[PDB]
Amino acid sequence: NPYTIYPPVPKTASINGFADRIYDQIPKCAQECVKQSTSSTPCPYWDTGCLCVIPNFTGAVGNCVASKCRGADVTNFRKLAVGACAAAGVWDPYWIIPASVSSALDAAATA
Amino acid sequence: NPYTIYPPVPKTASINGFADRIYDQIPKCAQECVKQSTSSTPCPYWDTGCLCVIPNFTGAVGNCVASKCRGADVTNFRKLAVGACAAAGVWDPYWIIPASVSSALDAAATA
Amino acid sequence: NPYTIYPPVPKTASINGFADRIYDQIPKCAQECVKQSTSSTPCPYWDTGCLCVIPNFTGAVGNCVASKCRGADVTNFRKLAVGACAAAGVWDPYWIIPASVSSALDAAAT
Ligand code: HEB
Ligand code: HEB
Ligand code: HEB
Ligand SMILES: [Cl-]
């Protein structure tokens, strides 16, 4: 199987494979945002790497953070998302979001 | 531009936008297969998402893989194709190929 | 058939072929708008491209967005509609709405 070139991940989760990695560290404004349903993805719900690269999922999370978070909270959330996805073995830019969502996050961070 | 709602892609490629995402991870038997010409598509040659959904292109790539790869190489190739196309923002089933091509790949995978 | 030159789409949908591409990305104010009935169209309900170009459907969707959404929400909804329709293989302007509806969306965005 192609997934053994990546670091192993727990095959269960409390929320989901992305959220579980950062839930306790993210700014409080972003906590509701990472509880996004994984049901519209092809990802096992525990699969961090997959949930880092499916834009219908990351974009929803990103849209929510851009709406709910401002300033350094946006910046810190993105650093944590990138970090978790990078450690899961995802390629640069690690947390894979739509360009429109990135622009919205940029704006929220500079508000 | 209408496509900024998708994750960004490099506007150049060594081979093409599809090949470039997976060339170093795919089995050797498929390396030449992904070098399929994009000239028969409406796709910019660097456009992964577009090259994931145009059936004369995806169909050609699949027929080639069904010929050049066997067993687990086929399954692994397909997983990589799907993963790249999904990350580019394509809808389910992500790497979109004709049913006949799907069937040939099924068979090549059982060898 | 003449439609096999286009990007294939799933011949099932949760809501419809248009809504399904963008439902999770659109502003919440527009969610109800994309659940518009497809009954006044000749489109299979799963057919993204068709639902991007039949103006009584696109017009109903647009009018509802123009009614329920303001500011960046309108702009963001429209980017998603245009983007999804372009990727489905529709011709420019991709999300093809009546002229009156474009104007209504224009006003709602400011
Ligand atoms: C589309 C779809 C998809 C995608 C995109 C993905 C993407 C991914 N992924 Fe995933 N996965 C999957 C789908 C997927 N996936 C599945 C289905 C599974 C399971 C398998 C079985 O169960 O058999 C996995 C699994 C898995 C695993 C486990 C393995 C073992 O067990 O050994 C891992 C580690 C991973 C990672 C990952 C990453 C890092 C990524 C990115 C980058 N993954
Ligand atoms: C038919 C045709 C077509 C199709 C089908 C498609 C499909 C697609 N696509 Fe494409 N694109 C295109 C055509 C296309 N396309 C073009 C022409 C372009 C360019 C535009 C301009 O530049 O103007 C693009 C572009 C593009 C881009 C870039 C933008 C910027 O600049 O940033 C992206 C990202 C994409 C994606 C995509 C996806 C994901 C898909 C699927 C899903 N695209
Ligand atoms: C009115 C009418 C109409 C319109 C306008 C349309 C428009 C359209 N469309 Fe549709 N379709 C249709 C009607 C339609 N449609 C139908 C009815 C069908 C089924 C099939 C037959 O019938 O043949 C289809 C089908 C179909 C398909 C599938 C194919 C096969 O067979 O596989 C596709 C992909 C499409 C796309 C599309 C697009 C992209 C567009 C635009 C742009 N489409
Ligand atoms: Cl993958």
**Structural contact between residues A39 and B92, judged by C-beta atoms closer than 8 angstroms:** no
d(CA A14, CA A3): 22
Q: Is A47 in the pocket of ligand 1 (CB under 6 A)?
A: yes
Is there an atom of ligand 2 within 6 Å of B88 CB?
yes
Cis-peptide into C27, omega within 30 deg: no
- Nearest ligand, measured from the Cα of A6: 1
Nearest CA-CA partner of A54 in C82, B82, B4: B82
Alpha helices in C1-110 (DSSP H): 19-22, 31-34, 48-53, 55-68, 72-87, 99-109
Tokens of A103: 């622009």
Closest ligand to C-alpha of residue B51 is: 2
Q: Please provide the distance, in angstroms rounded to a whole number, between the alpha carbons at the two ends of chain B.
A: 45
Total residue count of chain C as it appears in this document? 110
Question: Distance of alpha carbon B80 from its chain centroid, rounded?
Answer: 8
Q: Which two tokens stand for residue B98?
A: 């004709």
Please give the Cα distance from B94 to B52 (Å, whole number): 7
Provide the residues around ligand 4 (an ion) whose CB is within 5 A: B 83
Distance of CA A100 to the CA centre of its chain: 16
Q: Is B85 in the pocket of ligand 2 (CB under 6 A)?
A: no
The residue to mutate among A1, A3, A45, having the most atoms of ligand 1 within 8 angstroms of its beta carbon, is A3
Contacts of C79 in chain A (CB under 8 A): 100
Taking each continuous run of H as one helix and of E as one strand, the counts in chain A are 5, 0
For B52-89, give one letter per residue: b (16+ CB within 10 A) or e. bbbbebbbbbbbbbbebbbeebbbbbbbbbbbbbbbbb
User: What distances in angstroms separate CA A81 from CA A45, A98, B1, C94, C96, one per listed residue?
Assistant: 16, 14, 27, 33, 37
Measured distance CA(A86)–CA(A66) in Å, rounded:
21
Q: Which of C80, C75, C65 is nearest to C57 (CA)?
A: C65
Cα–Cα distance between C103 and B36 in angstroms, integer?
A: 44
Judge contact between B56 and B38, C-beta under 8 A: no
Q: Do residues A40 and B92 lie in contact, with contact meaning Cβ atoms separated by under 8 Å?
A: no
Tell me if B76 sits within 8 A of A4, measured CB to CB. no
CA distance C95 to C30: 15
Experimentally, the structure was elucidated by: X-ray
What is the rounded distance in angstroms from the CA atom of residue C80 to the CA atom of residue C95? 9
Name the residue at shortest CA distance from atom 8 of ligand 2. Answer: B50
Q: Do B7 and A96 touch (CB under 8 A)?
A: yes
| DSSP 3-state of C100 | helix
Question: Which residue of B69, B92, B95, B96 is the best one to mutate when testing the A interface, meaning the one whose CB has the most A CBs within 10 A?
Answer: B92
Whether the CB-CB separation of C32 and C24 falls below 8 Å is answered with no
B50 contacts in chain C (CB < 8 Å):
87
Distances (CA, A) of A53 to A10, A57, A81, A89, C103: 18, 8, 11, 11, 36
**Tokens of residue A89, six digits:** 């073995």
8 A C-beta contact, residue C57 and residue C40: yes
Q: Rounded to whole angstroms, how far apart are CA atoms A24 and A30?
A: 10
Q: To the nearest whole angstrom, how far is the Cα of A44 from the nearest Cα of chain B?
A: 13
Residue nearest to ligand 3 atom 30, measured at CA: C4
Experimental structure resolution, Å: 2.0
Closest CA to A102 of A58, A71, A53: A58
Q: How many CB pairs under 8 A join A and C?
A: 13
CA of A55 to the centre of ligand 4 (A): 14
C13 and C23 in contact (C-beta within 8 Å)? no
As a whole number of angstroms, the distance between CA C69 and CA B65 comes to 48
**B6 to C94: CB separation less than 8 angstroms, yes or no:** no
Question: Cα B50 vs. chain centroid, distance in angstroms?
Answer: 10
Concatenating the DSSP letter of every residue in chain B gives -GGGGS----S--SS-TTHHHHTTTS-GGGTTGGG---TTSSS-TT-HHHHHH-HHHHHHHHHHHHHH--THHHHHHHHHHHHHHHHHTPPTTSS---HHHHHHHHHHHH-
